[PDB]
Design a protein around this ligand. Structure first.
Ligand SMILES: COC(=O)c1c(C)nc(C)c(C(=O)OCCN(C)Cc2ccccc2)c1-c1cccc([N+](=O)[O-])c1
Lengths: 225, 11
């Protein structure tokens, strides 16, 4: 279990992943700020925007990513943004006593329950897998380097960067959870659950209590507003 | 197109 090049590849993913943190001035707003729908929405907005900064930073350092066509690199970034961002938020909800105040801000932010409800099911669903940091990081690379996104010119080039990340992730599922032989398969299933938010997202973008807000620049650009 | 995302990728 563990291959020299696979360790090298993992160490490289982790160097990059651990750099990615939610800034404390943002989390302080969760505790400090006035409680209403507008101010709550503004908070989530800042956090979403930060999701993108971090994931652009991660995407950039991914092994092989600079060797891809400049168009294709953008197609993968915009392609994976929604999936990637929800995943990161789930990591930052499951892994203090602030989850509670954040949840309450989320549920009193003018977003209707048809979106909020499966956000939280997903968080529970992924939280039951008890994933290590290393599993999260590889999953995130696996999502980001999906060959199945809209507009990719050279899909096979993307495939050949994704495949080794799946091989490593599978070994990590044996290493971290040997008790649970169906654990890797179970992570692939949560990716199925994760892809459903591409439709939940496209709808919200449309919705009146989501379209009549002016999203930060990075947001308008990544989400094709 | 995508000047912002291009800037952020090349830094
Ligand atoms: C401001 O919210 C949006 O308009 C939005 C859009 C148009 N698109 C995406 C992809 C995300 C999104 O990525 O969520 C992640 C939740 N983030 C924003 C907050 C958070 C951070 C850490 C832990 C929990 C939540 C968010 C979003 C989407 C659906 C449901 C919710 N919600 O339940 O709060 C938010």
């Amino acid at each position: 279990e563990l291959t020299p090049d696979q360790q090298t590849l993992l160490h490289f993913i982790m160097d990059s992943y651990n750099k990615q943190r939610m800034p404390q001035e943002i989390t302080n707003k969760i505790l400090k700020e006035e409680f209403s729908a507008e101010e709550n929405f503004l908070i989530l907005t800042e956090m979403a925007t930060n999701h993108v900064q971090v994931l652009v930073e991660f995407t950039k350092k991914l092994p092989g990513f600079q060797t891809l066509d400049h168009e294709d690199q953008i197609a993968l970034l915009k392609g994976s943004a929604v999936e990637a961002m929800f995943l990161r938020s789930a990591e930052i909800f499951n892994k203090s006593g602030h989850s509670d105040l954040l949840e309450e801000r989320i549920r009193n932010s003018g977003i209707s329950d048809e979106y909020i409800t499966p956000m939280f099911s997903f968080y529970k669903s992924i939280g039951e897998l008890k994933m290590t940091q290393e599993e999260y990081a590889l999953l995130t690379a696996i999502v980001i380097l999906s060959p199945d996104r809209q507009y990719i010119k050279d899909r096979e080039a993307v495939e050949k960067l994704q495949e080794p990340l799946l091989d490593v992730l599978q070994k990590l599922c044996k290493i971290h959870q040997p008790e649970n032989p169906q654990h890797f398969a179970c992570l692939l299933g949560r990716l199925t659950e994760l892809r459903t938010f591409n439709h939940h997202h496209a709808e919200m973008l449309m919705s009146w209590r989501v379209n009549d807000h002016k999203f930060t620049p990075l947001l308008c650009e990544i989400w094709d507003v | 197109e995508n000047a912002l995302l291009r800037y952020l990728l090349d830094k």
